[PDB]
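Notes continue from the previous slide.

Worked example: a multi-chain complex. Inputs as given:
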Amino acid sequence: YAWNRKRISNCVADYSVLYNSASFSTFKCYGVSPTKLNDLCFTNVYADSFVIRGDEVRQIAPGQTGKIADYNYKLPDDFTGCVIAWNSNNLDSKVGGNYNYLYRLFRKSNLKPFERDISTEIYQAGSTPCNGVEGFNCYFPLQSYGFQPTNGVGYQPYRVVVLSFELLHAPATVCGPKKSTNLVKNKCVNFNFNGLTGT
Amino acid sequence: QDVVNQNAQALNTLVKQLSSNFGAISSVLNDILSRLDPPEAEVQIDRLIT
């Protein structure tokens, strides 16, 4: 419910370094082929990171259902970018269980794509206005997690980052290690200017 | 004058039709070609073709 948003820009990027880093549980790219990522020049790549349960990772896609993707996180249907997720259990192996995380049970208004749910205060469930007593028909949505090594291998904690980079918006700044080249004129040749391609 | 005007209007509409997505994720072939793998770019190019 509280995910960081690391705004990233003005550098040269890479993708192959993310191929041998770890066999992530899912490295799935929508709108772009993960093989060509080092050939085009993006515009203001974002970075959202958090940790969930390993079975819920399916909910991270443009138009899925699921309590997390309905009350915590929301993707647009025209999303262009991709998701990386890997089981983080060896570093998050607490035999007593790690309980430093929470998430929603129910929300009045469901989230628009990419909107922070800062409304992490008391929540009213039904009738009998509780006014901050957590009584009947007033349920706290924030429920902890069951992340421990004894839990199911599918229920282990998973670290996820969703590189959400928009395209064709401004002077591009995020293309990778493609090298420059001398400039010629008066010859019918190919070209590539910050991703703008043609001949 | 009507002949010239009608021909020019038809030509302009035809050449402007090149800038519509028709449902695809772009309006220029080279973009989809450099941005996608063939097994997926097939359907988008097909939409643009129709």
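Summary box: The two ends of chain B are 34 Å apart (CA to CA). Chain B touches chain A at residues 25, 30-31, 34-37, 40 (CB under 8 Å).
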